[PDB]
Structure formats: structure tokens, C-alpha cells
Write a protein that binds this ligand. Structure first.
Ligand SMILES: Nc1ncnc2c1ncn2[C@@H]1O[C@H](COP(=O)(O)OP(=O)(O)O)[C@@H](O)[C@H]1O
Ligand SMILES: [Mg+2]
Lengths: 66, 371, 56, 188, 56
């Protein structure tokens, strides 16, 4: 007894810390930069949609104005 | 086959198969009947939501715990809780599995006898054994001596053990626990304007207590600091908005543990009942008990309690002895981990109360040699 | 005449409503992106912290 | 109230038959303003709001700022002398009387029904008002199905078509045994 | 008749546009609110970490 405390504690004392650091690094890398880039891309597409909407609205208002 | 290590507790039922690291299913032990009328037809409305289901529909229920202080006050609800635990959270029929319940020290006999009678007649288990909640917490620490303070949610008890020989004359059981701290916090929150009354809002106050409260290292200095600066005021968002700000209620709620005069209890705090429990022991094992003080149970998870308790005991104890407080990070499930270890032992395999033995001596078998 | 007056009127209401809806949509989306970018900046703060923690 | 404020331009409707004409005017022209003061200021300067309507005999009439003042009474019942608060604040009060744990769900599932909730632009005014009253974190959503007028009857058809409901009817023999006061009993 | 047909079709198209825009708004709102709650939670746990550091 009291000799399995080493073999159940020291293991996770380093392996768990290193593995969680690895998980955090990979999750941040996968998540943050890709999300910001994708949001910028969607913003550009949204601006293009806004331009198309403005053009169509203006041309239809020009024709229909009677 | 494998054994079922159930642990009734009072506030959270923890269960799982023997031989693992953590309980498989942990869920509050509340059974709440609906209280309003109900107009939708065919909605499939049941008559009682138990376990974790009633913590999501708690807006229209009247939750009521079936275990008050260790003892069980409402046997039908407890039977319902056990049935749910076996069939829906573990999905193993009890006809093929031994069970290992846990019970607080110094509890009424009738409670234990009724528990074994239920387990043998209704659920019809092959064999069940009842163990004291502190010996298991001592198993989990991997020790064999030490005095364990198991401050659960129902009752706080302090069982000293040396070399495997428990000292029955030195058990100090005190009925202040997490539930009384919840009620006292709910009572002192009214000093700022927030009124929680419904039995559903007791859960919200419990969440506030868990997430914000902490034990002060020195009480008077904290009371003076919180009354001048504002560095302590932490805010918290209710289940509907309207954030609240807790001031010096943060460390006043768990201070009740060390000064039970706050809620009107006469007895001394958990810092002095441990010293009294030690002093009742023999003069030659006091050093070992001083050096191996063990904490367990949920309520001992307050941030900063393992230092306050050590400071208090060092103040009380003689100056030469070394005071050490074992506070493992897996405190909450310490009793259940110990239960799993005990159920996994080969030497223990012949201590179960076999069903034929119960058939021959009745429910009073539990007080006999098979303890 | 009643029918077409009704239709054109409710259509004009529809156009004004939908344009207001589009302004709402864009504002919500851009605010969402700003908040998400703040969150990712916080995530990279945490990731720098994790790189420090690589000390373990 | 619309029949009473139309008199400010010269049109007098008195007969109980002409109440139907005023009802038709209300249905076809009135709308709920998103912001009341701005609309009152705009209608008093420009003339882009004045919509005309042909009576059952000719003599077209022009409704000015009576358009959004008639249905504004819903949100300010002080116009017709009623004391109580508008439909924007009795909903919030009805929510706040509920328990603290089901307020989020009620906030998110506010349902509109009935005929009078068909005014063009009410599902936005009500949402703006409740969002002003409610805590800033909760999401306020207002369900306004296009079939609002017959919503009660559609629900009635669904309820009558259920199999589970088939034994809740007040059978005639039951009425013969307990009299008309049977309705307050278990068969509600 | 011709004006009626064209007006009705324009109306129906705009109406369906309205409904779809509302649905999109609802979904983006749900996601943005979930992100908001995530942010509040991360900040709160960060502060708890800070107070844990204060303790030790
Ligand atoms: N992280 C925490 N911080 C403070 N108090 C806690 C925490 N977790 C649980 N508690 C308190 O402990 C109680 C749960 O104790 P528990 O050990 O489950 O009791 P039992 O012995 O009946 O299982 C809860 O009611 C709660 O008040
Ligand atoms: Mg316990």
C-alpha cells in the first residue's frame, strides 16, 4: 500500500499536463484563425450582396417610378 | 460478476460499477411532483420527475429531497430514486449484481434495516453490504491511519482510525452541513434585496454558493477589508438576467462551519470538533492522527479551507506536533472511489450479506457479524 | 381596383419591412463577427499562455 | 376611438350602420407606428402619409395622422381614458408573475393571435417595447404566423381531432345527472 | 387583370423573402447568443482562475 500512489499520480502529473497543453494548442490553432478568416470572407460576400441589392433596388425603382 | 457501488448520500446520488475511477452517473436526489394544473392534452406529462430530469423542469415542480440528515424520511421517494438509479442511469437489472450502500455513522437502526429489507425484497439483489462513509474515504487516500472529516451535504461526521482499528468512542457527528449553509446563504442574501423563497430557487442559491463563496483565512480582517474597499464584490447572472452582486456574503456563508453560532447551533466548529475527537483518543496515537488529518465530502471543496483548518488546529494543538491536512483534488468522489476499491478486494468477497442468510435471520442481520 | 390597391400597399409595406430587416441582418452579422474576433483574440492570448505552459 | 377622432377632419359617422364603414377604414388603412413621436412629427410636416378611401357612395376621404393614432391606443390605453397599461406592458407583467426559472422560455416564445394583432407593423413595435422592458441578456422573439385571425379555430380543430381528447366531452347523460353546473366540474 | 397578376406575383415573392429572412435572423441570433454566453463563461472562469492565483 501507498506504493501505487506514485504509479497513479506521477503518470498524470506530467502526461495529463502535456496532453492538455497539446489539446489547447491544437484547438486554438484550428479554431481562432480559421474563424476570423472565415468571418472576414463572409463579410466580403455580405458587402458584395449589399452592392447587388443596391443596384437592383435602384434600377427597379428607376423603371417602376410612374 | 461485477458489484454495484451505490452511494445514497444526501444531495447527490453517486453510483457506478466497482473497479473504475469515477462514478458512472451523478445526479441530484430530488423527486418533484408538478404543482400547477396543466392544460395541454396528450403532452405525456408524468406524475413525478426524479433525478436530473427535475433539475430542468424545476420551474413548475416542487422539489423535495427524500433524505434529510443522513436518515431517510420518505421511503417511497427513496425507493423511486433507487429504481431510477438502477434502471435508467445504469441500465443493469439488480437481479444479477451485488450492491454496496453507504451510511453515515450513528444513524438510527430502523433506517439501515429498512434499507436492507428494500434491497432484498423489492429490487431482489443477490447480496448487499452497508459500510460507514468515512472508512471508504480513508481507503481512497491509500492510508491506513488518520482521522477523516467527511463534511457531506447532510451531516458532518469525524471518524478517527488507527492502524485499521476504528475507535468507536471518538466519533463526533455534527448535523451542520451543506444544506444548512445553503439556507443561511439564502437568509443573508436578503440583506441586499434579493429574496429567494421557492424550493426551486434554493437550487439557484446553491449554485451561487458553489461558484462564489470561499472560506476566509482570517475572518475579522476580511470583514474589515470588505467594508472599506470593493475588491471582493463578484457579480453573478441569474437564470433570467438581472445580475446580482455578492459583497461580504461571500465568506460569511461558509464561515458558519467554524462558528455554528451563526445559525444558532450551540456546538463548536469543524475546527474544534476534530481536536476534541483527537483528544478522546489514546495518548500514543495522537501524533499520527495529527499528521494524517484527512478531508473528504463535497462541502470541504471551498477555496481556502485546507489552510484555515490547518491554522486553527495548529493554534489549538501543542506546538511540537506537526499538523498536516490531506486534501486530495478528487475530494467530492472520495467516498465512492474508496467504495470501489473496497468492493474490488478479494479479501472482502466473503463479507457480503448473502440472501439465504437474510432469509434465515430477517432484516436484523445487518447489525450482526456481517456489519 | 380594391384588390390591386391592397396588393400594392401591402407590397410597399413588405419592401420597407424587408429593407429594415436587411439592415438588421447586417448589423447583427457584423456585431457577431466582431464579438467572435474578440473571442479568438482571447483564445490566442490563452494559446500564448499555453505555449508558456509548454514549460510543462 | 377611430370614429371619434375622424370628427377632427369633418367626417361624422353616428349611425350603427356607419360603424361598419369605420371598421372597414380601420382594417384597410390603419397601421401601428414603430416610434410614435417621430411619426407624429413626420405626419405634421410632410404629406406622404395621407391615404384616401372611397366611401360606399363616393366623396373620398383623406386620413392623415389618424392612421397610426387609432391603433396606438393598444400601447397607451390612456387615450380612451382607460387607466391600465398597454399590451406591451401587461405581457411583461404577466411574465414577471411567473416563476423565475421559466421566464427565459416565455420570453423566447411570445405568441400573437386574434384578429386585432393583424395591424401592419405590430410584431416589431411590440418586440421593441418588450426588449426595452426586459433584461438585456434574454432573447425576445415574437411569433406572428400569417394565419393569425383563424389561429384559435385551427387550434380548436386540432384539439377536436385528437384521440386522447375523445373522452373529455361532456356527455348528455352526465348533464342529466348533475345539471348545467357540470361544466365547472372535472369536465372543465 | 394584367396589373393584378403582376402585383400578386411580386407580392408573393416579397412575402416568401420576408419569411426566409426572419428564419435566417432567428438562427444567426441563436448562434450569436450562444457565443455571447460562451464569452461570459470564459471571462468568468478566467476571473475564477485569477482568484485561484490570488489564493495560491
Ligand atoms: N465545488 C463546490 N464548492 C462548494 N461547495 C460544493 C461544491 N460542490 C458541492 N458542494 C456542496 O456539497 C454538496 C454535495 O455534497 P456531497 O459530497 O455530494 O454530499 P453526499 O455526501 O450526500 O454525497 C452540495 O450540496 C454543495 O452544497
Ligand atoms: Mg458523502
Amino acid at each position: 500500500d501507498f506504493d501505487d500512489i506514485h504509479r497513479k499520480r506521477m503518470e498524470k502529473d506530467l502526461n495529463e499536463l502535456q496532453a492538455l497543453i497539446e489539446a489547447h494548442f491544437e484547438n486554438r490553432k484550428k479554431e481562432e484563425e480559421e474563424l476570423v478568416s472565415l468571418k472576414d470572407r463572409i463579410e466580403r460576400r455580405r458587402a458584395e450582396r449589399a452592392e447587388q441589392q443596391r443596384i437592383r433596388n435602384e434600377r427597379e425603382k428607376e423603371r417602376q417610378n410612374r | 460478476t461485477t458489484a454495484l457501488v451505490c452511494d445514497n448520500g444526501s444531495g447527490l446520488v453517486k453510483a457506478g460499477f466497482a473497479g473504475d475511477d469515477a462514478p458512472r452517473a451523478v445526479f441530484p436526489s430530488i423527486v418533484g411532483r408538478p404543482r400547477h394544473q396543466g392544460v395541454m392534452v396528450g403532452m405525456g406529462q408524468k406524475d413525478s420527475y426524479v433525478g436530473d430530469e427535475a433539475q430542468s423542469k424545476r420551474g413548475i415542480l416542487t422539489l423535495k429531497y427524500p433524505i434529510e440528515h443522513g436518515i431517510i424520511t420518505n421511503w417511497d421517494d427513496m425507493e423511486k430514486i433507487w429504481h431510477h438509479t438502477f434502471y435508467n442511469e445504469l441500465r443493469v437489472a439488480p437481479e444479477e449484481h451485488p450492491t454496496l450502500l453507504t451510511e453515515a455513522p450513528l444513524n438510527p437502526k430502523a433506517n439501515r434495516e429498512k434499507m436492507t429489507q428494500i434491497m432484498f425484497e423489492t429490487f431482489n439483489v443477490p447480496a448487499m453490504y452497508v459500510a460507514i462513509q468515512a472508512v471508504l474515504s480513508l481507503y481512497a487516500s491509500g492510508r491506513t491511519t488518520g482521522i477523516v472529516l467527511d463534511s457531506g451535504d447532510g451531516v458532518t461526521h469525524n471518524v478517527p482510525i488507527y492502524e485499521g482499528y476504528a475507535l468507536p468512542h471518538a466519533i463526533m457527528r455534527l448535523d451542520l452541513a451543506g444544506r444548512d449553509l445553503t439556507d443561511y446563504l439564502m437568509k443573508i442574501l436578503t440583506e441586499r434585496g434579493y429574496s429567494f423563497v421557492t424550493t426551486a430557487e434554493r437550487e439557484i442559491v446553491r449554485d451561487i454558493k458553489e461558484k462564489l463563496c470561499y472560506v476566509a483565512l482570517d475572518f475579522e480582517n476580511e470583514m474589515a477589508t470588505a467594508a472599506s474597499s470593493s475588491s471582493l464584490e463578484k457579480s453573478y447572472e441569474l437564470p433570467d438576467g438581472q445580475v446580482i452582486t455578492i459583497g461580504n456574503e461571500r465568506f460569511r456563508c461558509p464561515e458558519t462551519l467554524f462558528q455554528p453560532s451563526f445559525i444558532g447551533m450551540e456546538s463548536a466548529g469543524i475546527h474544534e470538533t476534530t481536536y476534541n475527537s483527537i483528544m478522546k483518543c489514546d495518548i500514543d496515537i495522537r501524533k499520527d492522527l495529527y499528521a494524517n488529518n484527512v478531508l473528504s465530502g463535497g462541502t470541504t471543496m471551498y477555496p481556502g479551507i485546507a489552510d484555515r483548518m490547518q491554522k486553527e488546529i495548529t493554534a489549538l494543538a501543542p506546538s511540537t506536533m506537526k499538523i498536516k491536512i490531506i486534501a486530495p483534488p478528487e475530494r467530492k468522489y472520495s467516498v465512492w472511489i474508496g467504495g470501489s476499491i473496497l468492493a474490488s478486494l478479494s479479501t472482502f468477497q466473503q463479507m457480503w450479506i448473502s440472501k439465504q442468510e437474510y432469509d434465515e435471520a430477517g432484516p436484523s442481520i445487518v447489525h450482526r457479524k456481517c456489519f | 381596383s380594391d384588390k390591386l390597391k391592397e396588393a400594392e400597399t401591402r407590397a410597399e409595406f413588405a419592401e420597407r419591412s424587408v429593407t429594415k430587416l436587411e439592415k438588421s441582418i447586417d448589423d447583427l452579422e457584423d456585431e457577431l463577427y466582431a464579438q467572435k474576433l474578440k473571442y479568438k483574440a482571447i483564445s490566442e492570448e490563452l494559446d500564448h499562455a499555453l505555449n508558456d505552459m509548454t514549460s510543462i
